[PDB]
Amino acid sequence: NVAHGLAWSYYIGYLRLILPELQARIRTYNQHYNNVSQRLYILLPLDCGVPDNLSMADPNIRFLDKLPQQTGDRAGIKDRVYSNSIYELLENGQRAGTCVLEYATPLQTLFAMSQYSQAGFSREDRLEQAKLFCRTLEDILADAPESQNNCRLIAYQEPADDSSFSLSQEVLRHLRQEEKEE
Amino acid sequence: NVAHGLAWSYYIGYLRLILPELQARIRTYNQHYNNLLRGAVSQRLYILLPLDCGVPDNLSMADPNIRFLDKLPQQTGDRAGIKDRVYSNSIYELLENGQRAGTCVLEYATPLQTLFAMSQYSQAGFSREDRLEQAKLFCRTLEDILADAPESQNNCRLIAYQEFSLSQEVLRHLRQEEKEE
């Protein structure tokens, strides 16, 4: 089904390529600016609503800098570029954590397919496939080597209540758990 | 099914983003790089669709008569929390008897490579006939999507083929485009 293809493409076309080199790029960044935050944190909103600008989605998530980029040829395109963004996670104006953070882009394809009538894809389909995308991706990474397991999948539902929701707290909670399990 | 999702992924995640901006990048290139892509024919994105999903990463490896000249200026955009995610495209010359017979922006449709890799990695398995059918379904779904994207779709051309000179395959498409003008 749809989710199965998108999850394999996420591994084959991205994670398998960047996770092995991620550690070096973080070190290179640290020395510049005079020196848990070494994993790639991947947001997976299960409703597939994926904003492009993290800072405008949550005030307490603020862009810090980009890692050095990585490049590689693929499918006749010379020097495809892989870039990743560092964010600070705040609480009441105070830096509470720092990590490389992004959304799982293929969830935007699932969302768009549920919006374009030509795709023949309902909202219920999107929500099911989103969950299947997460489980397949989790299965794939569970069979991956150590050099490809240095990422954290963060899957979540936003409340159907009018109650507010903190994306920053959703990430910080996992940062805190990881510190504890050290 | 799989091919349906991959075609929508190819459109939603790539073509709808880069096609509306392609002419501006080509103008910028021509103006600061000697009008190398002259005429509408040389200003479309040519997408290769090998229906056997054989997608080498190096086009010169696929055909010596396809040779890399330069890269267009990069497009950047904020994308799913990544600041300045980068989209880049490569310019190739096509050779016929040692001389430059054509110049175009050329590349493979990457999801076809994905289909092939899935036959190797996928645990549930993916047979040859299934892969060839999903490759065809990807191409036809992409055709259908582009037909319903009138705003941006005339910035590209699909080159599908079964296996032979890839360079000639491309040149034939280019010559036909010039004749239809």
Place this chain on the structure above:
Amino acid sequence: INLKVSDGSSEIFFKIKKTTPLRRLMEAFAKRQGKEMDSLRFLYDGIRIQADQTPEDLDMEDNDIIEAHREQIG
């Protein structure tokens, strides 16, 4: 229900039930042209038709036209 298929150089009318899959028509029309069903692209309401779809599935009406274009891929 009555329907018609047109490629511009020829036209063939068909009469079938509403629950009969359109596989038969698309194969019938293409056979006349000397081409197999796959090499042609059939359209109704601007949408590519699939072999297992019936006029009831596509909400067809009597005396509709079906467009037959040369499929460029494959």
